[PDB]
Design a protein around this nucleic acid. Structure first.
Ligand code: MG
Ligand code: MG
Ligand code: MG
Ligand code: MG
Ligand code: MG
Ligand code: MG
Ligand code: MG
Ligand code: MG
Ligand code: MG
Ligand code: MG
Ligand code: MG
Ligand code: MG
Ligand code: MG
Length: 262
RNA sequence: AAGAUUUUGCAAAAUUUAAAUAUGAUGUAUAAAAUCUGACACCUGCCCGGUGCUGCAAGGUGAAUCUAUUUUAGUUAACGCUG
C-alpha cells in the first residue's frame, strides 16, 4: 500500500511512482470472477460513441457487498485484491459461519484485522472495540465520523464517495426529524436520513494522488487510447481545423462551447 | 507521460437515434467528457477599451391568446347580422 520511487535506470522510470499492488497477498478465486466483453466506447451496432477508449489488459469484475446488512457476525480478512477503474483495494471477509465475500476496505486496514456490521450502539461490540471499516447506521455513530460508501434509506445501491480516498464529512445532526446534512467531495450539501447506512473511514489508496504513470503504455493497457488535437485535424473533421491554430470561440466537434466565462 | 482552464452531484452531463432505447458504468468528483499546450528546472509580466463567451436586478424595443376601452365602414323596410 506504499509508493515506489524507482531509480532512473530508464527514461520512464525516472519520474514513475506506483503502488505496491500486493500480489503475494492476493489469493485469486473463481467464485466472484467474471471477464466480460471489453466495450471499446461502442454500442451494440459497432459505432463509436465515446472516443479515446480501447483494449484493457486489466479487465475483470469482482462482485462486492456494498450493502452488508444481511449479516452481523464478526469477521476477519484473509486476503486482498485490486480494482483498476477506481484504483481501490478490497479484501475477503470470512464470517464465523465460514461464509465469504469481498468488501470495500478503508485506509488503515490489512490482513489480520477484524470487521463486522453493527445494528446496535457501540458499547455492545465487545468484540471489535476498534470500529474502523465497519457497516453501521448513521444515527448509531459518534459525533465526529466520516462515511465512505453511503446507502440511503430510499435506495438499494450506493451512489456517493465510492472512489479512492473520499469521504462524507458531517455538518449537522438533527435527531428530531432524523435528517443529516452531509458534505460531498466537491463541497455541496445533501439531506440524508439517519436510518440510512454507510461504512466508516476513507476508502483505500489515499495515495493515488501521489502517482506518476511515466509511460504511455500504462494507460494503453487500461483502455485509454490516444487523444488527438482538434487543430492538427482538417477543417472537415473539426471546426478548428485549418492552418491557423487560433480560434474564436473554442469549441467541441459536435458543436457547443467548452470554455465558458471565457 | 505531465500542467492548466471549462462542464457534470447521479435514472449524472456529454454522446446515438424521429422515438423507445443504446450507452457512459454495475463506474460516483483521487470519477467521467471536451479543449489548448507538451519530460524536468527557473519563469509564465501590464491592460476588460474592442471582438467573443457566460450571466443579467431595474430600464428600453418586443408576438399571439384572454380581457377591457375607443374609433369606424358596408348592407337590410325594420330588428339585426358582419367586418
Ligand atoms: Mg459516429
Ligand atoms: Mg477522453
Ligand atoms: Mg493531444
Ligand atoms: Mg494538417
Ligand atoms: Mg461536413
Ligand atoms: Mg466546419
Ligand atoms: Mg504561421
Ligand atoms: Mg510541463
Ligand atoms: Mg488559448
Ligand atoms: Mg465591459
Ligand atoms: Mg450576451
Ligand atoms: Mg433577459
Ligand atoms: Mg424586461
Amino acid at each position: 500500500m506504499f509508493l515506489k520511487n524507482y531509480k532512473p535506470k530508464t527514461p520512464t522510470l525516472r519520474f514513475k511512482r506506483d503502488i505496491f499492488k500486493m500480489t503475494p497477498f492476493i489469493k485469486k478465486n473463481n467464485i466472484f470472477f467474471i471477464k466480460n466483453k471489453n466495450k471499446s466506447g461502442r454500442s451494440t451496432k459497432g459505432q463509436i460513441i465515446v472516443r479515446h477508449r480501447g483494449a484493457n489488459k486489466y479487465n475483470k469484475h469482482l462482485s462486492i457487498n456494498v450493502n452488508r446488512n444481511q449479516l452481523t457476525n464478526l469477521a476477519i480478512i484473509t486476503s486482498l485484491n485490486y480494482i483498476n477503474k477506481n484504483s481501490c483495494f478490497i479484501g475477503l471477509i470470512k464470517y464465523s459461519n465460514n461464509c465469504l465475500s469481498y468488501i470495500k476496505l478503508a485506509n488503515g486496514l490489512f490482513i489480520g484485522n477484524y470487521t463486522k456490521s453493527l445494528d446496535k450502539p457501540l458499547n455492545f461490540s465487545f468484540n471489535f472495540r476498534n470500529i474502523l471499516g465497519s457497516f453501521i447506521i448513521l444515527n448509531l455513530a459518534p459525533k465526529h465520523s466520516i462515511f465512505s460508501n453511503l446507502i440511503s434509506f430510499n435506495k438499494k445501491k450506493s451512489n456517493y464517495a465510492k472512489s479512492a480516498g473520499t469521504f462524507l464529512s458531517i455538518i449537522k445532526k438533527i435527531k428530531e426529524i432524523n435528517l443529516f446534512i452531509l458534505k460531498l467531495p466537491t463541497g455541496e450539501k445533501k439531506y440524508f436520513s439517519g436510518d440510512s447506512k454507510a461504512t466508516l473511514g476513507r476508502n483505500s489508496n489515499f495515495l493515488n494522488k501521489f502517482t506518476v504513470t511515466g509511460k504511455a503504455g500504462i494507460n494503453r493497457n487500461k483502455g485509454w487510447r490516444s487523444s488527438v488535437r482538434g487543430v492538427a485535424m482538417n477543417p472537415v473533421d473539426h471546426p478548428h481545423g485549418g492552418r491557423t491554430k487560433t480560434n474564436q470561440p473554442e469549441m467541441s466537434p459536435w458543436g457547443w462551447i467548452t470554455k465558458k466565462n471565457k
